[PDB]
Every structure is written in C-alpha cells, then in structure tokens.
C-alpha cells in the first residue's frame, strides 16, 4: 500500500535506517505512478544517505590506499576493500538510474520535477563515473553531462534563479565541471552566474524555499572562493 510504504520510509528516516527508507520508496516508485513532492523528497533523501555513506567510506579507504604506498601488502588490502565498497556504489547508482529511466523521468509531468529528476540522473551518473574504469568512464561522464545540461536548459526557461532546485542544479553541475572535467574556469563561472542571478532576483525567493536556497547559495559562494584562490 502506498500510504504504508510512505509511513515506513518516515519511520526508517526517524530511526536513521536509510537502507530501509530507500527500499520502501523504491517499492513506492515501482508501483508506476507519478510521485508527489513529499514522496520524491523522501526517495531522494533516502538514497542521498545510502549513496553518501559509501562515498564517504570510499574516500577514507582510497586515502589510506594512497598513504600506504611502499607497504605493498597493506595497500593491497585497502585496494580490495575499496573495490568491495565500489561494488556497492555501482549497485546503488544502477538502482537509482534504473528507477529514473523506467519510472521517474517518464512520469514527470511538470518542469520542476523533470529538472529535479534530470539533476538526480546527472548526480548518480557522476558518482558512477567517480569509480568507473578506462573507456567505460568517458561514456558515463558524458551521460552525467547530458543529464545536467538538459536539466540546466529546462530550469533556465521554467524556474526563477532563486528556486532551490535550479540553484542545487547549478551547484552540482559546477561541481561536476570542477571535480570531474577539471575545468575550474567553467565551474567558477557557472557558480558565479547562478549565485549572482539569485541575488539579483532575491525579491522572488519565497518563504518556504528560503532555507534551502540560502544554504545552496552559501555552498556556491564557498565553492567559488575555494576555486579562485
């Protein structure tokens, strides 16, 4: 039952059991109907946490693998552990991207939710690319880029510069440019433009979106400081 899956997701959220939270929002999605705003946000928060934990663990272990160069057996054990974590990463990404391809992007009937889901697709493709090998990596980076660009174009036409989804999209696309394509210039200019446009139309920032937009605007301006230093 949809009501029930959604309640479970909320309980799991309260219990900080994000794997369960994701599983029931997965089930809610596979029922095939367009998610409400609440459901979409639940789903995204759940997988944010699921994927986030693994990305964090990956970084720690990758860092150890680096610092153990010279101690070849220690490094090997780190390397194998990192691959374990990578296998989980791929699976989670592939799960969300399949959800996006089969359910969420097809069923998105308003511009806002189209942009939300294309952004999410760019995100999970980015995470995938971060742990993909050789020729497979190039192709996945490109899928990330295309999903963000399409999102970016729709948002430019349909959403105010103060809209948290359009800002969040600008933040993450700028991060892609910086961290994935090694373009600080392009990253910085995207971040700068989104930030400046939000300020210039600050009058449009609604009461309900105030907290999320300003947090993102903070992340944009911090990123911009770091990059141009």
């Amino acid at each position: 039952d949809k009501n029930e899956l959604v309640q479970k997701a909320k309980l799991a959220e309260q219990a900080e059991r994000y794997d369960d939270m994701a599983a029931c929002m997965k089930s809610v999605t596979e029922q095939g109907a367009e998610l409400s705003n609440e459901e979409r946000n639940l789903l995204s928060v759940a997988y944010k946490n699921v994927v986030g934990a693994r990305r964090s663990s990956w970084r720690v272990v990758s860092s150890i693998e680096q610092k153990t160069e010279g101690a070849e057996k220690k490094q090997q054990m780190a390397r194998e552990y990192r691959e374990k974590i990578e296998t989980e990463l791929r699976d989670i990404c592939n799960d969300v991207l399949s959800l996006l391809e089969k359910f969420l992007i097809p069923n998105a009937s308003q511009a806002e939710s189209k942009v939300f889901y294309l952004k999410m697709k760019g995100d999970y493709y980015r995470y995938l690319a971060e742990v993909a090998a050789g020729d497979d990596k190039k192709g996945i980076v490109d899928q990330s880029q295309q999903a963000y660009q399409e999102a970016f174009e729709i948002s430019k036409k349909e959403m105010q510069p103060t809209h948290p989804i359009r800002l969040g999209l600008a933040l993450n696309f700028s991060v892609f440019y910086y961290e994935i394509l090694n373009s600080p210039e392009k990253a910085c200019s995207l971040a700068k433009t989104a930030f400046d446009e939000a300020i210039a139309e600050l009058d449009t920032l609604s009461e309900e979106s105030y907290k999320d937009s300003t947090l993102i605007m903070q992340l944009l301006r911090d990123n911009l400081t770091l990059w141009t230093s």
């Binding site: 994000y18 995204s44 944010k48 946490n49 986030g52 964090s56 995100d123 969040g168 993450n172």
Partner: peptide, 6 residues
C-alpha cells in the same frame, strides 16, 4: 548516513 553532493 551521510549528506552527499546535492
């Protein structure tokens, strides 16, 4: 269990 690039 970790807020992630978003």
């Amino acid at each position: 269990l970790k807020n992630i690039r978003h």
